[PDB]
Each structure stands twice: as C-alpha cells, then as structure tokens.
RNA sequence: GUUACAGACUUAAGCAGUGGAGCAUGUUAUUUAAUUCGAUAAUCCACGACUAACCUUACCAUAUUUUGAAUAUUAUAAUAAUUAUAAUUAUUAUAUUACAGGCGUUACAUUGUUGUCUUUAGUUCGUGCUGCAAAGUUUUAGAUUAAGUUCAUAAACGAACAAAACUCCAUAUAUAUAAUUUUAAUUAUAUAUAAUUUUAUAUUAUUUAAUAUAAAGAAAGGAAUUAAGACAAAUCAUAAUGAUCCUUAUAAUAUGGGUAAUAGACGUGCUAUAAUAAAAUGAUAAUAAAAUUAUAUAAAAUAUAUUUAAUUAUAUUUAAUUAAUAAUAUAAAACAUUUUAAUUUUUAAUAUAUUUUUUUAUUAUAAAUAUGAAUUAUAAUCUGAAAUUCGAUUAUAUGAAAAAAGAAUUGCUAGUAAUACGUAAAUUAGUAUGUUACGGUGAAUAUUCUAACUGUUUCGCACUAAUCACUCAUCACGCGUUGAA
C-alpha cells in the first residue's frame, strides 16, 4: 500500500482541539495494567 | 577424461589471469 | 416479526438478490467486541417491507 | 549457468591463499562447479550440518561442490 | 487499470479504519461520547471521490 | 543491527503489519530500487559478444548481490491477513480472506458465482 | 438382531473403473541434525497447500541482533518546510522505561467459518384447550406430495424460521441499440412477456384422480439457497481474542540443509497390458465453446536439430493488442487412405488370369512385439543470481513390470455416464498425472426380494453422557461385622 496514509498519531498533529480516543490502544494498555497488578507483567528486559 | 571434456565444451569462452579475478580470500 | 417479504409474493415487482446471496429487503451485520472473558459478537439482522 | 554458453556456475572463494599454502577452502557453496584451476586444492564443503573435507578429484572437474557432500544420512529401518 | 483499482480499494479500506478511530471521543476524561458510524461507501467517479 | 532488521530503513506498510509482510516488503523494495543495475549486469554477463572477463565480473557481482536484490525471493503475501497460500493477484488476499471480503462487499464488483 | 409402508444411486439391471503392473501424489510407519505444523470413521488421505530450488517456512546446523514493527512518557541535538537573521511546526538521530513480539499451549475458553445429519422436513411463537402434573393438542382419523404441501376431519386459530416461490444460468418471443470495418446481426445486452403449462374425449376407481388418446404450445434442464438441534466434529497455521508460558529468547536477520529421507502398509490418480484399436499422413487448412494478455500475450519470417519441406523442439526478433478490433490458437476426436507383431491369417522367385492396390499353383519364408515406456547413460536447451541434494524440455541410446487383474469395492439415469475428444485459467521467474472451468461426440440399462441410513409408523424398553447404553456372578487386592469350631 501507500506507506503514508493517516494514522491515529497524525486521527494529534491535524485537530489538537478534539480529544479522540484509540479504542485497541486503550484496551492493550488496560491488559497491561491489569498484568502488571496481578504478578504476570513482562520481565524486565537485559541490556548487557 | 572429465577436465578433457570441460575444457571442450568451455573452449569458446576459454576459461593465471581467471583466477585472479575469480579469488576474493575475504570470506572463508 | 418475520423476514419474507409479500410484495414480491403476489405483484409485478421481484425479490433481487445482493451479491447474489442476500435478498434486497435483508441486510444482516455483525460487530466483536472483546469482553474480560474472551472474543463474543452481535449478529444483527433487519426486513424491511 | 547450466547451459553451455554462459557456463560455469562461478563463485568467489579463497584460492589463491590455499594454492600458495596448504589451507582448507570451507565452502557453503554447493552449487560452485568444479574448475581445472582447482584440482589437488583441499575443500571442507557444508552439508547442512558440519563441513566435509574432500580433496578435488581429477575426475570431478565437471560436477559441483554440494555433489559430493551428502547430506542425508543413510536410511535403516529399526525391526522391530 | 486493476492495479490502480486494487490501491484504490486498499486505500479506502484504510480509511474506513481510520474514520472508526476518529468516531470515539473523550470530554476531559468525563464522558466518553461512542458516535456508532455504519461501514463507509465510497463512490469514485472519474472527477470525485465520494 | 539492533535499531532496524534489514540494513536500511523502509517504511511500515499500513493496515496489516506482520513479520514475514516485513521481510517480503522490505525485499519487494530493495528489489525495485536495484532492478535496473541488476539487469544491466544480467546483460553483461550473457554477452558472446563483450569481452569474457568483463562478463566474468559481472557474474560475480550478480552472484554477490544480497538476498534483498533477487526478485524471485519476492512471495505474493495476503495484504488483509498475512498468508502466502492461494493468493489471488487481482485483489492481494488470501483465500479465505478473499471470500470473508467478497460476501461482505468490499470487492469492487465480486459476487456468488451461481451460473 | 421390530410390524409395515415410503425414500435414493440405497440395492438390482447396465456402462466405465478401483483392487494385480509400473509411475505420480497424499498418508502411515520407521529413519533423520531437521524430515515444520495441522487434517487422520462415515464427515483424513492431489486435504489445509491454485505450483516447497533460494524465498515461501513455520523445522535443523552455524553465525549474529536485543525497545527491536508499534503506542506513549522524558530529554538533549540536527535538518527542512513555512513566515517577516529570529521563530513555529514537522521529521530524524542518541537514549529512556512501560513494552513490542511469539506458526509457543489449549477450537474441552472463544470468535468467525466449515464438515456430517441436510434441499433433509423438520423447528418454534403468541394465544386457546386437555391432563394434579412432566407433557399433549396444534404438528392428523382419511389420503397425497419431492415436501409440516395440499385436501378433508378434528380443541383448535394463527405465526417464524425452514419447504415452495421470488434469484442466477440456459431457452422461446417482442422492443430498443450497433451508420453490418471492433461484425459474430447465424451476434451482444438492456428491458419486458412466457408455464410450478393448458384444454378436451375415453377408461378404471371414487364432484375428482391416475392412465391412454388428441390439439395448443419453443416449452426440457442445471446452479445458488442445505432450518433447528446435535457430533465438546474441523480450524488458536487465514485472522483475531481469553487464560497461560518465553522476554539475550519460545522474539529478529543471514548462509546452507530439510520439508522430496525409504523395510512393509494404506488411500486417491496417471499410463498401460494391440486390430469392435494403435500409429504416418490430410494448406483453397472439416467442425467448437469458454477465458487470458501493462508484475504482458508474443504473430509472421530466419537459423540449428534434419538435404529437400512439413512436422516437433529451441534460438534469432518483436508485427499487432492492452482488446467484440491483435495474440494465446489452422481445436481434437470424427471421417479417408496407408501400416500394423502375435499370425506360413504374410512376404518374393517363377509362372498364372475376365478378383490385377488382386487371384491360383509350386518353391523358399522356423508366450512381451514394429505392444508398453519404467529404469538408466551421454549430449544439448529453458527459467533463474543459483537447478548438487531438488525443477522443466529436446535428441541419441537404454526398453523393467504388465497377457485386462482375487475377497471385496467406486462413480453415474441423459446432453448424464463414457471417451487413446480436445480447449482454457488460477497459482509461477520455472514446473500439473492436481484444481477450477469450457465446449465436441454420445449410450446402455430400470422395482421387486434383503442388509444399512435418514423421516413416517406398530409393539417392546430395567437405556436418559440415551446400546461405544445399562448390567449379572465367580476369581484376585485391602479394611470391618457376624456365624461355625
Ligand atoms: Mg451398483
Ligand atoms: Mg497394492
Ligand atoms: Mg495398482
Ligand atoms: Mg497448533
Ligand atoms: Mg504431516
Ligand atoms: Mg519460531
Ligand atoms: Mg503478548
Ligand atoms: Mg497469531
Ligand atoms: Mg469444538
Ligand atoms: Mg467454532
Ligand atoms: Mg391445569
Ligand atoms: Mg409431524
Ligand atoms: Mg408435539
Ligand atoms: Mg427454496
Ligand atoms: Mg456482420
Ligand atoms: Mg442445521
Ligand atoms: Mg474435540
Ligand atoms: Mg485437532
Ligand atoms: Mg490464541
Ligand atoms: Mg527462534
Ligand atoms: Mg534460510
Ligand atoms: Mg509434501
Ligand atoms: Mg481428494
Ligand atoms: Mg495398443
Ligand atoms: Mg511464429
Ligand atoms: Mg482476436
Ligand atoms: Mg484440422
Ligand atoms: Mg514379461
Ligand atoms: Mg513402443
Ligand atoms: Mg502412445
Ligand atoms: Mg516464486
Ligand atoms: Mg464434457
Ligand atoms: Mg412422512
């Protein structure tokens, strides 16, 4: 496809004026939160 | 007579200067 | 109520089919959403006359 | 490059180095044809596995490299 | 030319989704307003898109 | 290296992303940026004609060409899905894919087929 | 392992096959570093996969990546666009955590979808009525249909989902359009109309319903649609998601190898085993349809294989057309002449003659071929960067098995089967014995008996995860209790 096409990022940049929302995002990020809190967050990462 | 007979089917393009081109000892 | 349609029973007019597989009057959709539990959906189907 | 005109199938090795000193060529080639510029130079062909030496015969001038290096194991059935 | 019929579909595809991501709104984390949109019908003529 | 996969920076394709889509993207793009070198080598290397040492040269450098040149490497993947089985060229989808599409009416003009 | 009907490719006829042979392909098993994973009774086995050289791939060996494909947070710095040497923004770079990512595990957590029962005729709704009630009626006395579809009778009346119908293809007719060079008007395509055909005379059984006859009509099919429930049927490998596990590794990239291994076995196919059948030939080119060609289709013609040339295969080089206009592409069986071993059922030397592409006479002509095409050797060609494992052609040699196939077993009632009849596309850079599609030529047979399996019913029922049901006793293992002695 077209490489640049709109994004939910940009939907900030176009209209900062309305406060959208990104439903799949928000739902990942509660998943995480809930992992988090019941002792199944990823591990933390090694660097070496 | 295995080299006899690729030295007659490669007669024309006639194959030292070929292995010189032909030797990049970098990767091994 | 009920999901065939009687003007195309006993008039002129005929039932027509969208891709071939849907009559006209029909139009049938479905939406999922994730729940905590797991993947469930909403099949929706309306007649209209 | 099978066919005759445009033959051989050409790659790039470390040659001239083991022409001058005895020094194995670890090929993962396989599909490099043999040449007369090659015959008496120690070669350690892969097999998928582990790399196998062959010293190029006289005789296999025409075949490739990957010829001689078998890389199924010889079958068996187990009677039981 | 096909190609160019199958980007174009593709495109439109894209922007449906994106459209869908717009629809949801939030109000200073107070109300969080669903606008439901049907799937999108897009009528390209040969001047417009519609 | 650790900053991107392949060794120069492309561009996610949108929609679906995958990591075999990756790979054959990326490939798909080098290929188009180093079609014409390549054919030009091909050439001079098929050449009865031109000097054998050049062709011979020729050879080499197509020989040492990256996995990312070759354009029989490039695999026709699924765009909606990312499957590289019974995909249909004139709407990049895969089978299944392909009829879940038609039933609900993206296809442009695809319907049942019932004679 | 029941009563009696009804049902159909169920059986019976019939036609062609499978099962024996070799090859192809899938599966199994075993092997292997890896032979990736799933499908595996009907409802797996050219299935997922409409093309495994690299890729695809998920598997293995060796290398090497570690905020990685995203989103957000926090900072430094650099470039470009816009404005009237500053600033605003957009991006990029280096980092920074939360994480990202996972074809890892569970379709006995799910979604969607699909298979089988199933184009089978069932499934429910109100409501009413019967029964203390679970339930029943509706959903059937009587028949009939393909049919819960239609008559009647009935404590029923309707209904919804099913059935049918509308739908698509094909057909007939009409109208419109096409300056009849994009022509095929014998066409294509929009819009109608047409039939689930009608009418009448008779002959059987009771006003109707089957047979027959007649006159009126082009009037005769196929496709899609496969309900509820069930099978914890299939799919976490289209994709997504729950839970769970991996986070320098179960995530990511490259080079090679593997998926193509081979004892036996199992399906599907293909090619065969020669004369109601194979091969040569057939240019005023016998006769099609359907579909593809800007990730192309490749015409004519030249050259080589090949002393003429044609055929077939490559190369040379692109004419035409991105298409009712050109190309893929002179369709093939058919039909006609010729030949054909087994076959002393023929040949060739003589004569012979009103069978002369032939006859007669007398001489000599003494279980796999002039079937089949497996297997292998060498040489070329094609695609690709690359053809060793591991691709496709052509040539010159090679010429296994196989003598119409045992118990059993598959498909098919008509434009169907059959066809040593061909044609096309999807998947490709490249390879179809597969898939999906098109026309060509075109049959044989026919219902009464029995197994099964769907819906109907009779009787039975100790079964209800519903006969893979339930269930009876010894013997064996432990721990009690109570007798005899
Ligand atoms: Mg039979
Ligand atoms: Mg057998
Ligand atoms: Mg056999
Ligand atoms: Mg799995
Ligand atoms: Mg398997
Ligand atoms: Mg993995
Ligand atoms: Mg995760
Ligand atoms: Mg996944
Ligand atoms: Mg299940
Ligand atoms: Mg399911
Ligand atoms: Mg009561
Ligand atoms: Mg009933
Ligand atoms: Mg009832
Ligand atoms: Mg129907
Ligand atoms: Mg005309
Ligand atoms: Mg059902
Ligand atoms: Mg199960
Ligand atoms: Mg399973
Ligand atoms: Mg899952
Ligand atoms: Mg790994
Ligand atoms: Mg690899
Ligand atoms: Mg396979
Ligand atoms: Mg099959
Ligand atoms: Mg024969
Ligand atoms: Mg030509
Ligand atoms: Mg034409
Ligand atoms: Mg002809
Ligand atoms: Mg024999
Ligand atoms: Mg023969
Ligand atoms: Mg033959
Ligand atoms: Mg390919
Ligand atoms: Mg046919
Ligand atoms: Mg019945």
Same mark, same amino acid.
């Given at each position: 496809?077209?490489?640049?096409?709109?994004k939910?990022?940009?939907?900030?940049?176009?209209?900062?004026?309305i /406060?959208?929302?990104?439903? /799949? /995002?928000?739902?990942?990020l509660?998943?995480?939160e809930?992992?988090?809190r019941?002792?199944?967050?990823?591990?933390?990462?090694?660097?070496? | 007579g295995?080299?006899d007979?690729?030295?007659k089917?490669?007669?024309?393009?006639?194959?030292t200067?070929?292995?010189?081109?032909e030797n990049?000892?970098?990767?091994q | 109520?009920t999901?065939?349609?009687?003007?195309?029973?006993?008039?002129?007019?005929?039932?027509?089919?969208?891709l071939?597989?849907?009559?006209?009057?029909?139009?049938?959709?479905?939406?999922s959403?994730i729940?905590?539990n797991?993947?469930?959906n909403?099949?929706v189907?309306?007649?209209?006359? | 490059?099978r066919?005759?005109?445009?033959?051989?199938?050409?790659?790039?090795?470390?040659?001239?180095?083991?022409?001058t000193?005895?020094?194995?060529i670890?090929?993962?080639?396989?599909?490099?044809?043999?040449?007369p510029?090659?015959?008496?130079?120690?070669?350690?062909?892969?097999?998928?596995?582990?790399?196998?030496?062959?010293?190029?015969?006289?005789d296999?001038?025409?075949?490739k490299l990957?010829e001689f290096?078998?890389?199924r194991?010889?079958?068996?059935?187990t009677?039981? | 030319?096909?190609?160019?019929?199958?980007?174009?579909?593709?495109?439109?595809?894209?922007?449906?989704?994106?459209?869908?991501?717009?629809?949801?709104?939030?109000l200073?984390?107070?109300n969080?307003?669903k606008?439901?949109?049907?799937?999108?019908?897009?009528?390209?003529?040969?001047?417009?898109l519609? | 290296?650790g900053?991107?996969?392949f060794?120069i920076?492309?561009?996610?394709?949108p929609?679906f992303?995958?990591?075999?889509?990756?790979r054959?993207?990326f490939?798909?793009? +080098?290929?188009?940026?180093?079609?014409?070198?390549?054919?030009?080598?091909?050439?001079?290397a098929?050449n009865?004609?031109?000097?054998?040492?050049?062709?011979?040269?020729? +050879?080499?450098?197509?020989?040492?060409?990256?996995?990312?040149?070759?354009?029989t +490497?490039?695999?026709?993947?699924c765009?909606?899905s990312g499957?590289a089985?019974?995909?249909?060229?004139?709407?990049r989808?895969?089978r299944?894919?392909?009829?879940?599409?038609?039933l609900?009416?993206?296809?442009?003009?695809?319907?049942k087929?019932?004679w």
């Amino acid at each position: 496809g077209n490489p640049d096409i709109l994004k939910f990022r940009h939907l900030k940049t176009l209209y900062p004026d309305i /406060e959208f929302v990104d439903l /799949e /995002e928000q739902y990942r990020l509660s998943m995480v939160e809930a992992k988090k809190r019941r002792g199944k967050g990823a591990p933390k990462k090694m660097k070496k | 007579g295995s080299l006899d007979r690729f030295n007659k089917r490669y007669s024309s393009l006639f194959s030292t200067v070929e292995l010189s081109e032909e030797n990049k000892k970098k990767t091994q | 109520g009920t999901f065939n349609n009687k003007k195309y029973l006993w008039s002129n007019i005929n039932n027509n089919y969208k891709l071939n597989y849907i009559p006209s009057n029909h139009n049938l959709y479905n939406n999922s959403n994730i729940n905590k539990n797991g993947k469930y959906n909403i099949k929706v189907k309306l007649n209209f006359i | 490059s099978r066919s005759v005109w445009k033959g051989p199938n050409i790659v790039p090795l470390p040659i001239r180095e083991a022409m001058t000193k005895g020094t194995p060529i670890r090929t993962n080639a396989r599909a490099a044809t043999i040449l007369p510029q090659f015959v008496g130079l120690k070669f350690q062909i892969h097999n998928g596995k582990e790399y196998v030496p062959i010293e190029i015969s006289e005789d296999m001038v025409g075949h490739k490299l990957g010829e001689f290096a078998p890389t199924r194991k010889r079958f068996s059935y187990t009677q039981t | 030319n096909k190609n160019m019929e199958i980007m174009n579909t593709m495109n439109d595809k894209l922007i449906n989704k994106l459209l869908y991501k717009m629809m949801t709104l939030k109000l200073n984390n107070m109300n969080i307003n669903k606008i439901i949109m049907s799937k999108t019908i897009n009528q390209h003529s040969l001047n417009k898109l519609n | 290296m650790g900053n991107f996969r392949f060794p120069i920076k492309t561009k996610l394709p949108p929609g679906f992303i995958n990591a075999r889509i990756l790979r054959d993207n990326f490939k798909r793009q +080098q290929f188009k940026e180093n079609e014409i070198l390549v054919k030009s080598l091909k050439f001079i290397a098929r050449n009865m004609n031109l000097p054998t040492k050049l062709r011979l040269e020729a +050879q080499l450098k197509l020989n040492a060409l990256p996995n990312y040149m070759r354009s029989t +490497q490039i695999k026709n993947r699924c765009v909606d899905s990312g499957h590289a089985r019974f995909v249909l060229s004139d709407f990049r989808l895969c089978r299944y894919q392909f009829r879940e599409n038609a039933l609900k009416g993206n296809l442009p003009g695809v319907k049942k087929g019932i004679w």
